């Protein structure tokens, strides 16, 4: 019995900032999705193009698991066809997305009383991300007609900003860990199936 | 090893036309395929990821397609600056690259601009004398240069080098250098470079006297 | 603009070792993988290996594991490629490249400019740079063409720029030719006859394997 290593994804010690979202390739294993869907710890579990109760009856060539941290009010952006700073500049799903979006509140682990500022998001970008594009660039963003010469200043912004998570914040400003499972269905041999 | 095969070594097209570059994987690679552009002298530049996604900033006339073993990079409204070699890559199992497809642009004919240059005084003082002829911005690539010294043809000591197609006007350029010793250079007076190109029955002649 | 800046071309004796560097500007390497790729004219592009700068773990194509070592320094944002006991088969352009994703394999979105490694027992020879002045292509062209002859250097490459790159249009640098173990190339620049010799035109040559440079102003003859 070679189960898919979901634990390595969902219980990873550290989670990426959303701008630097991580992706794991899941192949050649048996996936018991029902353990995930039946887990109450998940505040969000939304599937697209498949039904979550029937996941254990389907086979895919590959599964991808993207993971990162965002704040509560932004979880709604992790869906096809959405707009906003996360959907436009940090993590973009395709319109034809087939998969599941899973999230849970991580205030107890990602907030700290002095405020935790290690988690970052991109606040400025010259164009919207293409689907599954990943931008890790740090160049000063030129908001006006004056070039920035790589220095921050008036209309010249560092493009990444910290969330600032402290446990006292409202739910919409608390940290959420997110895992997005992408189900690849090509017409090649399947390598990830349910039991 | 997964081998990526690009059967086309060269492809030709015109500005404004479209071309499709093919790549075949020896095993199924799904959509773990990328495409890269390499202009002469430069490093590869990324164009496509996941078989069919274009990076931000990449012109929309580049499109990737295919799944499994057969992949295509399509370039529409071809521009002179697209002159480059195009390489596929799979990253499903390790990382392997195709052998590259070089694009050639067809354009209208253009006569060369010819310039001849006597040896530098600095080179002469060191004992050598290279006379240089540039044949710049002509099309098509085929051209002949003939060196003459005091009216008679000279073949030994001549070395020639051609550019790749220019990325702005898609023309070719060529350099021809006649090297000889200082004394030999001082034994004759007339040095001439003559270029014959299909744009004119009469050769293009440029000359100087010491 | 994001740039992966590599160290200069190197001449290396057979059997010796060399270490190449790639410094990133515009992102932190700790957010991705850094890879090295080899290119030769006939054998094409070959992946050597790559590194995870977070944990230091590197992985290699088995053909390269005994002679390549990839390291990284996140504090200076630099990746390194160490090659040992070089042979003529190691003469090649080596590129650094970054990966798209972290956690799994992906394409390479950014590439350095490449570093030519030449393996030979010959010594370095810097070029002689000679100006090419008219030269009786006499006015009246609206345009005038000048050049620089970069003669007798080893190994490749040389870089040629004109007025420190400010004259990039109208420049043609021709491939080098090899004769009796030394390379020669030419570079041409075309400018309006109003600027020259009214304004100065200079070719800037660098020969990274000998750590030499030369500027040569093109002045009217006599
Ligand atoms: C995470 O760890 C807990 C034990 O602390 C375990 O019960 C749970 O199944 C793990 N999650 C996954 C997805 O395996």
Author numbering:
A (entry chain A): 333 to 527
B (entry chain L): 1 to 210
C (entry chain H): 1 to 222
Could you pull the original sentences from the published paper?
Transmission between individuals is driven by the spike glycoprotein (S) on the viral surface. Both SARS-CoV-2 and SARS-CoV enter host cells by engaging with the angiotensin-converting enzyme 2 (ACE2) receptor, which is recognized by the receptor-binding domain (RBD) of S15. Here, we obtain two cross-neutralizing antibodies (7D6 and 6D6) that target Sarbecoviruses’ receptor-binding domain (RBD) with sub-picomolar affinities and potently neutralize authentic SARS-CoV-2.
In this study, we raised two cross-neutralizing antibodies, 7D6 and 6D6, by immunization of mice with the SARS-CoV-2 S-trimer alone (7D6) or in combination with the SARS-CoV S-trimer and MERS-CoV RBD (6D6). We obtained crystals of SARS-CoV-2 RBD bound with Fabs of 7D6, 6D6, or 16D8 and determined the structures at 1.40 and 1.92 Å resolutions for RBD:7D6 and RBD:6D6 complexes, respectively. Their common epitope is distal to the RBM, consistent with the SPR results above. The paratopes of 7D6 and 6D6 comprise six and five complementarity determining region (CDR) loops, respectively, with a buried area at the antibody-RBD interface of about 796 Å2 (HCDRs accounting for 73.3%; LCDRs, 26.7%) and 1,019.1 Å2 (HCDRs, 54.7%; LCDRs, 45.3%), respectively. The epitopes for 7D6 and 6D6 are formed by 21 and 25 residues, respectively, most of which are in the η1, β1, β5, and β7–β8 RBD loops, with 18 shared residues. For 6D6, the binding site comprises predominantly two RBD segments, one from residues 351 through 357 and the other from residues 457 through 471. In particular, 7D6 bound the RBD with a 2-log higher affinity than the trimeric S-2P, and 6D6, which showed comparable binding affinities to the two proteins, had 2-log higher affinities for SARS-CoV-2 proteins than SARS-CoV proteins. In all interaction scenarios, the bound Fabs would clash with the adjacent NTDs.
